[PDB]
PDB file of C-alpha atoms in Angstrom:
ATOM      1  CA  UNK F 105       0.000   0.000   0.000  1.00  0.00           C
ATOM      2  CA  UNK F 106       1.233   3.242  -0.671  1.00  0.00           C
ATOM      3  CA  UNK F 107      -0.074   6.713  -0.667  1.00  0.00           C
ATOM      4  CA  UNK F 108       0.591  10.618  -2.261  1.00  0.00           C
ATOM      5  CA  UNK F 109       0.267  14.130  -0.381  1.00  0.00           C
ATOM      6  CA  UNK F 110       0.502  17.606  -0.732  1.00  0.00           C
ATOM      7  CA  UNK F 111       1.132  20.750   1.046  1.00  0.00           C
ATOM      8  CA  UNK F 112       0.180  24.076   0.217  1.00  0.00           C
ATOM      9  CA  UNK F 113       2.331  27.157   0.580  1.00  0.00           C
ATOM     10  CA  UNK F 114       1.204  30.281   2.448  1.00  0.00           C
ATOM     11  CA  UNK F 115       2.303  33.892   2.532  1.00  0.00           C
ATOM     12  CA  UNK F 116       2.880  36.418   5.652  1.00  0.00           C
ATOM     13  CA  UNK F 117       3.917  39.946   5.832  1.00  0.00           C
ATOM     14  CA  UNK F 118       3.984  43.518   7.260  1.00  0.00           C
ATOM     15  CA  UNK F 119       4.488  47.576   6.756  1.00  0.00           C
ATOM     16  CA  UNK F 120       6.853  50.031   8.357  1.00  0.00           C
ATOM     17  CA  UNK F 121       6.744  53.525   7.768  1.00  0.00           C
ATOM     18  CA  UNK F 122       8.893  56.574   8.443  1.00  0.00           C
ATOM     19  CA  UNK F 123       8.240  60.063   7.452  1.00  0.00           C
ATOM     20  CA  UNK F 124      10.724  62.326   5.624  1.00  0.00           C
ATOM     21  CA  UNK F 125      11.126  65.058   8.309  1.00  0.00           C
ATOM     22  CA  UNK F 126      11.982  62.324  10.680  1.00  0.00           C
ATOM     23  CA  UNK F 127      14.837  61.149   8.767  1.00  0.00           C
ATOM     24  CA  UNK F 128      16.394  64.744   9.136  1.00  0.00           C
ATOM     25  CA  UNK F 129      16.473  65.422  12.648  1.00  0.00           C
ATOM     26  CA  UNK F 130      19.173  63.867  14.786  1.00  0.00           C
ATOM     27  CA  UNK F 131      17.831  60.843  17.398  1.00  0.00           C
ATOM     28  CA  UNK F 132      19.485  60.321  20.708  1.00  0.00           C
ATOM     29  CA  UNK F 133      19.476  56.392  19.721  1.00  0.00           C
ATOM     30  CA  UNK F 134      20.394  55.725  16.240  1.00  0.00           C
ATOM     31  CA  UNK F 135      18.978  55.499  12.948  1.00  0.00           C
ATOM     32  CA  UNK F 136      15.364  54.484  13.091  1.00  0.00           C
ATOM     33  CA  UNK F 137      15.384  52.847   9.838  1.00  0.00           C
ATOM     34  CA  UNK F 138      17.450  49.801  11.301  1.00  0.00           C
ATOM     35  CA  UNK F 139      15.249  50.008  14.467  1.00  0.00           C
ATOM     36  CA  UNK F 140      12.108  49.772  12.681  1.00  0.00           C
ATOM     37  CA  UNK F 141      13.396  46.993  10.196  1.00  0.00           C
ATOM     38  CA  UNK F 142      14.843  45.297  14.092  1.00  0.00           C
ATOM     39  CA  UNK F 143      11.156  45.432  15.211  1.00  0.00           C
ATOM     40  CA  UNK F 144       9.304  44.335  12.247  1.00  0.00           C
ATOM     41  CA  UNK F 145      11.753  41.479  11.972  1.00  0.00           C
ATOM     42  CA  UNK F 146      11.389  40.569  15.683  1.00  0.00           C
ATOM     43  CA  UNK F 147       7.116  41.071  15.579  1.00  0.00           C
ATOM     44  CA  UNK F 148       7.270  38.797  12.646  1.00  0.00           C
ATOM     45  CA  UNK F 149       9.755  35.975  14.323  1.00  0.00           C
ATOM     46  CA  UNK F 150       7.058  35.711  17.232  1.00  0.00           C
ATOM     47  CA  UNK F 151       4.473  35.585  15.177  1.00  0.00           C
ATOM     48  CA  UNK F 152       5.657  32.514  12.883  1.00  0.00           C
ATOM     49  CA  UNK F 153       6.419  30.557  16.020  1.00  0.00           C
ATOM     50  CA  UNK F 154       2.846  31.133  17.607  1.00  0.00           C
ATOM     51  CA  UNK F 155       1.591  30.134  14.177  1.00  0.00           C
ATOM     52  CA  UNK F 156       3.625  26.724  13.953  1.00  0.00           C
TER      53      UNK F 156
ATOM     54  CA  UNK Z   1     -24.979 -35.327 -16.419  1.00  0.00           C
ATOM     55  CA  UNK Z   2     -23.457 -38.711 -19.025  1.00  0.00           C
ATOM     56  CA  UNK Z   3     -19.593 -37.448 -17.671  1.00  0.00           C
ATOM     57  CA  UNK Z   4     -18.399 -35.713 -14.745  1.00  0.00           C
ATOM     58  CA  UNK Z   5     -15.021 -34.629 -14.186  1.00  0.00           C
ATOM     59  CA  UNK Z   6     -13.415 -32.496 -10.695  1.00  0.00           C
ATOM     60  CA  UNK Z   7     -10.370 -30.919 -11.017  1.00  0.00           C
ATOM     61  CA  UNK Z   8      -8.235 -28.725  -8.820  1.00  0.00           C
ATOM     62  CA  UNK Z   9      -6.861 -25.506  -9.717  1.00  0.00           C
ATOM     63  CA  UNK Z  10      -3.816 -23.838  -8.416  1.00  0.00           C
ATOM     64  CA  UNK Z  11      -3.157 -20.327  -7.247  1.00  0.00           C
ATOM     65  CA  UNK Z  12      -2.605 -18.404  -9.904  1.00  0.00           C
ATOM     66  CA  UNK Z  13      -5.865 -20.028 -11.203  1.00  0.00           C
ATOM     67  CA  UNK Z  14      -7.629 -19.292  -8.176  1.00  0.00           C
ATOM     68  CA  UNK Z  15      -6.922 -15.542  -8.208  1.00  0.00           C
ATOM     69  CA  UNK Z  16      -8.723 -14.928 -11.916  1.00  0.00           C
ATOM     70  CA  UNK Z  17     -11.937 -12.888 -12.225  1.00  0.00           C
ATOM     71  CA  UNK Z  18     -13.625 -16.159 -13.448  1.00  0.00           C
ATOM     72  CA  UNK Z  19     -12.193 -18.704 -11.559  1.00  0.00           C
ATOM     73  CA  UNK Z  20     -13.394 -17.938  -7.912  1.00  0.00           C
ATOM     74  CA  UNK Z  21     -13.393 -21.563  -6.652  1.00  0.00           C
ATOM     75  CA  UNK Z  22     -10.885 -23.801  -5.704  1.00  0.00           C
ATOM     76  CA  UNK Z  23     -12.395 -26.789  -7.883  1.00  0.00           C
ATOM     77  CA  UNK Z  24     -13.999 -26.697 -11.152  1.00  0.00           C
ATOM     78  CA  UNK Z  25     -16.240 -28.722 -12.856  1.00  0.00           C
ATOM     79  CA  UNK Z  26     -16.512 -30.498 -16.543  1.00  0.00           C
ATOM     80  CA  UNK Z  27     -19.955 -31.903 -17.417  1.00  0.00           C
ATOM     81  CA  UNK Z  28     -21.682 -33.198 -20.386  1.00  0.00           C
ATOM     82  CA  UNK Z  29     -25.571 -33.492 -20.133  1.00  0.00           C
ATOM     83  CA  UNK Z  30     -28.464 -34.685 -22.565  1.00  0.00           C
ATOM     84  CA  UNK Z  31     -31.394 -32.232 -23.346  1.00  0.00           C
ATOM     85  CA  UNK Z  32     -35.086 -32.850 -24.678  1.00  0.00           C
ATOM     86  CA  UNK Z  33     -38.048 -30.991 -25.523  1.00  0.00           C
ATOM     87  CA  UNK Z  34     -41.213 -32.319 -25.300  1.00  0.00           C
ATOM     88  CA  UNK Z  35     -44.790 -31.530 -26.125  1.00  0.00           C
ATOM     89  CA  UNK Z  36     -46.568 -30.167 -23.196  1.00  0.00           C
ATOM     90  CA  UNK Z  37     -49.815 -32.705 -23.561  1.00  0.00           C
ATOM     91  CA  UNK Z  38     -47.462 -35.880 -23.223  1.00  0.00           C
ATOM     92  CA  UNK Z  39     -43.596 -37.334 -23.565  1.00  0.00           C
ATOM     93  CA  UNK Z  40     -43.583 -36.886 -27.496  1.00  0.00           C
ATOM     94  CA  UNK Z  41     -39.699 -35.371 -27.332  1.00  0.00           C
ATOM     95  CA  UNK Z  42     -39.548 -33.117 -30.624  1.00  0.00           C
ATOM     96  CA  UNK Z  43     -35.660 -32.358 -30.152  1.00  0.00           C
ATOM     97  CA  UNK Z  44     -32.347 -33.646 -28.167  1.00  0.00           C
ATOM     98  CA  UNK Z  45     -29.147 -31.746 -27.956  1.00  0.00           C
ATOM     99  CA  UNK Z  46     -25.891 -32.536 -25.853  1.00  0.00           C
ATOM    100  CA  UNK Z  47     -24.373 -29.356 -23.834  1.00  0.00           C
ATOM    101  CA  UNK Z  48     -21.093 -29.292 -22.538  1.00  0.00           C
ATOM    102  CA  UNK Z  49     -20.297 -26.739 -19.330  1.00  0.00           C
ATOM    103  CA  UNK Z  50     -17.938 -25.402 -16.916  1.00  0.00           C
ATOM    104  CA  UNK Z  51     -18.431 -24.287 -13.667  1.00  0.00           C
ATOM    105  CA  UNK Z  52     -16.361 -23.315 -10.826  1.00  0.00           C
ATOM    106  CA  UNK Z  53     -18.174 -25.102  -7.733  1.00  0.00           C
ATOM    107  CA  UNK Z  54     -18.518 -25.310  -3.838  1.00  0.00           C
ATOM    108  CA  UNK Z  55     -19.014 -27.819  -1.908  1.00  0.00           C
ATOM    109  CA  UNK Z  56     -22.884 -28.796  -0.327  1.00  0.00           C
ATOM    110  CA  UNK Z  57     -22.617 -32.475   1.191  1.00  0.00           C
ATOM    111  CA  UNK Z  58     -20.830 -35.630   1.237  1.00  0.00           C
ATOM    112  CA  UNK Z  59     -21.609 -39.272   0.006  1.00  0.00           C
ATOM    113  CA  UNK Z  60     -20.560 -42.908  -0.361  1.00  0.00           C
ATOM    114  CA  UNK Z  61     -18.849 -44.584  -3.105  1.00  0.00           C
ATOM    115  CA  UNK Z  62     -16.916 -47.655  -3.913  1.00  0.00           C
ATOM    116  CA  UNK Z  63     -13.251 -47.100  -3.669  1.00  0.00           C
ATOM    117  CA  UNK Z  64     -11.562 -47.911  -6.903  1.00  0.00           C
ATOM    118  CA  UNK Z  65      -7.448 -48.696  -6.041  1.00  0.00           C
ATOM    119  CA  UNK Z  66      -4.205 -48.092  -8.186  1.00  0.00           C
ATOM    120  CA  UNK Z  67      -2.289 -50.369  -9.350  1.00  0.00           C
ATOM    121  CA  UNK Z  68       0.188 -49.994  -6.126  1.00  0.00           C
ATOM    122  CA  UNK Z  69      -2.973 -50.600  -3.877  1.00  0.00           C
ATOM    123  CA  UNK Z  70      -5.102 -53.152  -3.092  1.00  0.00           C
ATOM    124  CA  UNK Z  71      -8.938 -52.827  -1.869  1.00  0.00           C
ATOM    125  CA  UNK Z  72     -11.163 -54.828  -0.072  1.00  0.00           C
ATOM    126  CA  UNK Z  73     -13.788 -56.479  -1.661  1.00  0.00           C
ATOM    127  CA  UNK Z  74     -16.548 -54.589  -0.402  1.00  0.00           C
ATOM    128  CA  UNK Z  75     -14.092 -51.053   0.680  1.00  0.00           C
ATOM    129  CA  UNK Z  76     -16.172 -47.645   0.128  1.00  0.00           C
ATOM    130  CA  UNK Z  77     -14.439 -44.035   0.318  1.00  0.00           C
ATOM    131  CA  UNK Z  78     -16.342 -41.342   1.167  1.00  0.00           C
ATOM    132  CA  UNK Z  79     -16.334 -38.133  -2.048  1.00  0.00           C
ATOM    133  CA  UNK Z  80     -18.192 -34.478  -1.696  1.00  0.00           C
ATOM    134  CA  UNK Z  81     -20.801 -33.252  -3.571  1.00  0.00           C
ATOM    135  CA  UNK Z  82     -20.753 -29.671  -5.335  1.00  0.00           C
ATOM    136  CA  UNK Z  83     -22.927 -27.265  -6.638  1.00  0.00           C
ATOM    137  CA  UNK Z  84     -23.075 -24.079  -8.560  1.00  0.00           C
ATOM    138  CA  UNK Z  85     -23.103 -20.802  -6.348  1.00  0.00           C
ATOM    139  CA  UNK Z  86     -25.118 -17.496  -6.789  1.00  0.00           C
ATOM    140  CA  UNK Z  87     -21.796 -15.125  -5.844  1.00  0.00           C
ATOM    141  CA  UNK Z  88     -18.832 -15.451  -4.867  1.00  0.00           C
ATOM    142  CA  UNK Z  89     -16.389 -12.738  -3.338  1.00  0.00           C
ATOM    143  CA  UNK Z  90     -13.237 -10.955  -4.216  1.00  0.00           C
ATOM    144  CA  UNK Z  91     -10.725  -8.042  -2.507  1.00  0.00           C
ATOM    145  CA  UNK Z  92     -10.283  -5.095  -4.512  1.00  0.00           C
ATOM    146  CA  UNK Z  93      -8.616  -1.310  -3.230  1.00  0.00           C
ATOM    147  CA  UNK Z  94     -10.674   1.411  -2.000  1.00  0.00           C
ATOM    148  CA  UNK Z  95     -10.789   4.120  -0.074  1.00  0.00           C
ATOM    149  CA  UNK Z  96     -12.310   4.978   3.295  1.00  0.00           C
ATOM    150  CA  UNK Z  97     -15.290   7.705   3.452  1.00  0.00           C
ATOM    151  CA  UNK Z  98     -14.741   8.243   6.978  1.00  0.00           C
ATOM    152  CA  UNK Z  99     -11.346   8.248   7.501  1.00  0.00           C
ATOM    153  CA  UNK Z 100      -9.430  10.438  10.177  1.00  0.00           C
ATOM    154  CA  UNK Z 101      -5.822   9.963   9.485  1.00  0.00           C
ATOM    155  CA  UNK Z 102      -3.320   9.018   6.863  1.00  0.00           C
ATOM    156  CA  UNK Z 103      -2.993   5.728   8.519  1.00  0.00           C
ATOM    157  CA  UNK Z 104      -6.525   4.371   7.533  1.00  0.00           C
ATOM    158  CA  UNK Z 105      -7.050   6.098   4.323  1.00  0.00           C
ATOM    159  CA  UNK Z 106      -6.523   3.174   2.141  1.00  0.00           C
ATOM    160  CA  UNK Z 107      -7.899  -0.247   2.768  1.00  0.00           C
ATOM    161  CA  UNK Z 108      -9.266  -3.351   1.100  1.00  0.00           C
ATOM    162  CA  UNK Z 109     -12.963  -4.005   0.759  1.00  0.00           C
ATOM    163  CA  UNK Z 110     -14.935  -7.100  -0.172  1.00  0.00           C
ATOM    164  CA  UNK Z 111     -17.368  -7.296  -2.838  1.00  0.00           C
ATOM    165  CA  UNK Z 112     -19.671 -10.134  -4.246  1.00  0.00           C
ATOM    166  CA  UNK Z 113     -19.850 -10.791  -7.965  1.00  0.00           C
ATOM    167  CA  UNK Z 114     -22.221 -12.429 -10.149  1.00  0.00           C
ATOM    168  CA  UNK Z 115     -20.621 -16.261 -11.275  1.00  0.00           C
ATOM    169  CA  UNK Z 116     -21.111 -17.023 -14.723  1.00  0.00           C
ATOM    170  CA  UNK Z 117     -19.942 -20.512 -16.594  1.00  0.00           C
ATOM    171  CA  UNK Z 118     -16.554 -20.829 -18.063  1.00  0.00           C
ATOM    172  CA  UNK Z 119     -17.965 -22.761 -21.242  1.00  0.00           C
ATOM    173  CA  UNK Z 120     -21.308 -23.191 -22.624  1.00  0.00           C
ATOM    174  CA  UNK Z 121     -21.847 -24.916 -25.616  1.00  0.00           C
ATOM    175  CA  UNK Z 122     -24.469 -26.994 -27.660  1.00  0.00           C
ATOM    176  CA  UNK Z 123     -24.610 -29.591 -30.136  1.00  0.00           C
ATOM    177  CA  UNK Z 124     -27.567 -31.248 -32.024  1.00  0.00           C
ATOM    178  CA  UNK Z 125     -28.568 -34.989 -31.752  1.00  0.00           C
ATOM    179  CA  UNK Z 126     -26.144 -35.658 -34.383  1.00  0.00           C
ATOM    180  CA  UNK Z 127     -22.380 -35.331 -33.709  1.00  0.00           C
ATOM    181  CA  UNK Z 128     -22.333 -36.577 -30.346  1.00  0.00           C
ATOM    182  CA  UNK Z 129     -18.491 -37.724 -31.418  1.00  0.00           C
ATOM    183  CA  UNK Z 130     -17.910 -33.810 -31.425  1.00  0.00           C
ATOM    184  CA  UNK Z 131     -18.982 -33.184 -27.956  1.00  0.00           C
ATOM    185  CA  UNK Z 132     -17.314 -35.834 -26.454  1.00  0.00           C
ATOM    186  CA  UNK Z 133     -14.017 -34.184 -28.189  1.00  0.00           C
ATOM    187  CA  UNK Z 134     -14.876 -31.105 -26.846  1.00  0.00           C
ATOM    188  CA  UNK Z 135     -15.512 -32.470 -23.561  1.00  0.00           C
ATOM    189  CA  UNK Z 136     -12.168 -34.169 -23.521  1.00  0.00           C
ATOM    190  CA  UNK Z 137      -9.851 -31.449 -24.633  1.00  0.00           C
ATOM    191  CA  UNK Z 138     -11.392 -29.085 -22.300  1.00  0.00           C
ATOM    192  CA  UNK Z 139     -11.344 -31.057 -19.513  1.00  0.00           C
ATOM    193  CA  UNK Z 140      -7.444 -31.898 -20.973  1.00  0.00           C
ATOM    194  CA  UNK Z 141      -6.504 -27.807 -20.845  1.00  0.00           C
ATOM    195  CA  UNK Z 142      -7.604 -27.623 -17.790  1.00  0.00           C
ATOM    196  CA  UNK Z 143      -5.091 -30.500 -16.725  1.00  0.00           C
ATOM    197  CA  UNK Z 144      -2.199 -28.978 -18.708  1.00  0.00           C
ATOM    198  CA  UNK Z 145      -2.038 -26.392 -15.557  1.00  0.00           C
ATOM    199  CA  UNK Z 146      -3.528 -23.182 -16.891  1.00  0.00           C
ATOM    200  CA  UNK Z 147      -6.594 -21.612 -17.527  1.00  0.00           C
ATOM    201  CA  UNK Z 148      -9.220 -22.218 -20.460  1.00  0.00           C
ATOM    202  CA  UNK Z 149      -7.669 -20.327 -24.012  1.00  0.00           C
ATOM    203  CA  UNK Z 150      -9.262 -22.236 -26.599  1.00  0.00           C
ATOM    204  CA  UNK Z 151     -12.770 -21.872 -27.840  1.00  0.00           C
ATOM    205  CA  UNK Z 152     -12.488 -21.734 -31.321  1.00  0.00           C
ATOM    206  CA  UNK Z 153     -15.231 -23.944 -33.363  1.00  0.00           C
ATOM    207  CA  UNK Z 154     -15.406 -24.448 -37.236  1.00  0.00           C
ATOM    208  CA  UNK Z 155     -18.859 -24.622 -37.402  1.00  0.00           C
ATOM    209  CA  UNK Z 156     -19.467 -21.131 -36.222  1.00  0.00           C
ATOM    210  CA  UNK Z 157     -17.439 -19.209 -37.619  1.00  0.00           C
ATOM    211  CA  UNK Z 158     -17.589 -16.629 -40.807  1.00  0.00           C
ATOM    212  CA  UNK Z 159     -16.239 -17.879 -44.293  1.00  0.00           C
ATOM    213  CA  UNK Z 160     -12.424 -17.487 -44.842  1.00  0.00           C
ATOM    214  CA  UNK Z 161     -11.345 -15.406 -47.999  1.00  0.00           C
ATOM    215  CA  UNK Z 162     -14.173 -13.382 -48.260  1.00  0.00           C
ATOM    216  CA  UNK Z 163     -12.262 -10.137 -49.206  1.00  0.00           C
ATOM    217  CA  UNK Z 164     -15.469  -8.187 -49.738  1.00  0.00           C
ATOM    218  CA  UNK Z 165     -16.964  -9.078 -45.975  1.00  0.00           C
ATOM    219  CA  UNK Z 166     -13.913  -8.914 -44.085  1.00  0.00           C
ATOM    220  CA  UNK Z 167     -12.697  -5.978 -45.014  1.00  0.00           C
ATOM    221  CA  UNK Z 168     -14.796  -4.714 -42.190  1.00  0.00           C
ATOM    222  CA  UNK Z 169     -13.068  -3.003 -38.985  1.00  0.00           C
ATOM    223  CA  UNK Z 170     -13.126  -4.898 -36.007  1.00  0.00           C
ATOM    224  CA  UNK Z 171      -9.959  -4.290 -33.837  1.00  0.00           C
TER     225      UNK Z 171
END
């Protein structure tokens, strides 16, 4: 006896945003395009392991 | 039934569509048609079958020895009795309606098939020397180890070199 299966793929994302003023003035802790690409990486780690 | 003949079939036999039975049987049998107001017969014909067969009872018969036996004068040997079936089964694949897993998806069901004879022909009153031939080389195939291949009869059969008729598909 044998048998044949399949698996379908599936799709996840998310937005960031920054405005163009904020880019100009000078932050007290770093860029805040790394930060917000840091955060929307970690937000989407957690959410792939609550969803396995 | 003028001849009877049991055989036994083997395995690969046994597994065929038409050969559901671990034993078949050879017979030749006498037919009439009479009048319905008395016994006038108005026609007799001699029909030679196949059938595979199960078994239904038991009886007693003399026992007949070889020649490196000896029997007792009155020594009886006890022989079953078969008859034709209505159905008979056989395991095919399938799948399960209600399954809940991938462990009990596929399985093997049973199902009961009509049985229909493995040979089935007639002769007139006449030619009774053909039906016994017929008799005897089917009953012969069968003992060469195989199943039944050859049917093929002269006397039904279309005309040979008939260019105009054959030309006709029939793959």
């Amino acid at each position: 006896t044998y048998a044949r299966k399949a698996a379908f793929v599936k799709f996840l994302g998310t937005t960031r945003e920054v405005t163009h003023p904020m880019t100009l003035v000078n932050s007290a802790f770093g860029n805040v395009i790394a930060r917000q690409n840091k955060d929307g990486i970690l937000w989407m780690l957690k959410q792939i392991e609550q969803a396995l | 039934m003028l001849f009877k003949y049991i055989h036994d079939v083997n395995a690969k036999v046994e597994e065929g569509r038409r050969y559901l039975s671990d034993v078949v049987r050879v017979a030749l049998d006498k037919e009439e048609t009479t009048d319905p107001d008395t016994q006038e017969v108005t026609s007799t014909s001699y029909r030679v079958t196949a059938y595979p067969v199960v078994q239904v009872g038991e009886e007693e018969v003399p026992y007949i020895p070889v020649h490196p036996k000896t029997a007792e004068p009155g020594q009886k040997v006890t022989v079953p009795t078969y008859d034709v079936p209505e159905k008979l089964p056989v395991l095919v694949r399938g799948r399960n309606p209600e399954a809940t897993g991938d462990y009990d998806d596929h399985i093997w069901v049973t199902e009961e098939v009509e049985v229909r004879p493995l040979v089935d022909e007639v002769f007139k009153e006449d030619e009774f020397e053909k039906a016994r031939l017929y008799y005897e080389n089917v009953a012969a195939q069968l003992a060469e180890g195989d199943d039944i291949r050859h049917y093929y009869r002269k006397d039904l059969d279309r005309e040979a070199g008939h260019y105009s008729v054959s030309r006709y598909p029939s793959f």
